[PDB]
């Protein structure tokens, strides 16, 4: 909180927005890049998914709500309809950011983002385990 002042509201509202926000960013592109963004955004929602899954609840029901929570894309309780709002850490049901809602520090994601992408391009390179 105090050393990292810049934080992103929500951990799952950031998720399903980035689905759309990248889907839009995908939608703008075409060719492979529209796909090359798409399935990247289709790697996202599992993060709130395993949450409610491990909560013995339906993440699809929960994550589609955040997906359903928008007009354009952002995370606020201000318009919790017209944008994304928060998350429930015991569920994945969006929590009002300031009240029960999630906030995530700035580096938490940009670091979590790239490494998986770093790991993704890694195995992708390797076709040969070849031995004697």
């Amino acid at each position: 909180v105090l050393e990292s002042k810049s934080v992103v509201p929500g951990g799952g509202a950031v998720e399903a927005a980035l689905s759309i926000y990248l889907e839009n960013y995908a939608t703008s592109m075409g060719s492979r890049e529209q796909l090359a963004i798409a399935e990247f955004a289709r790697s996202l929602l599992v993060i709130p998914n395993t949450l409610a899954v491990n909560a013995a609840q339906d993440s699809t029901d929960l994550v589609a709500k955040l997906r359903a929570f928008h007009n354009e894309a952002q995370v606020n309780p201000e318009r919790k309809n017209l944008k994304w709002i928060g998350l429930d850490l015991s569920n994945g049901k969006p929590r009002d950011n300031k009240q029960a809602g999630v906030f995530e520090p700035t580096i938490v994601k940009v670091k979590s983002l790239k490494f998986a992408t770093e790991a993704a391009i890694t195995i992708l390179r390797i076709d040969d385990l070849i031995k004697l």
Binding site: E23, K65, R67, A68, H70
Partner: peptide
Amino acid sequence: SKYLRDYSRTIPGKQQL
């Protein structure tokens, strides 16, 4: 596709699937 994947965004409690 968009128009519904709009509704895949828009409405779903679930059925965006």
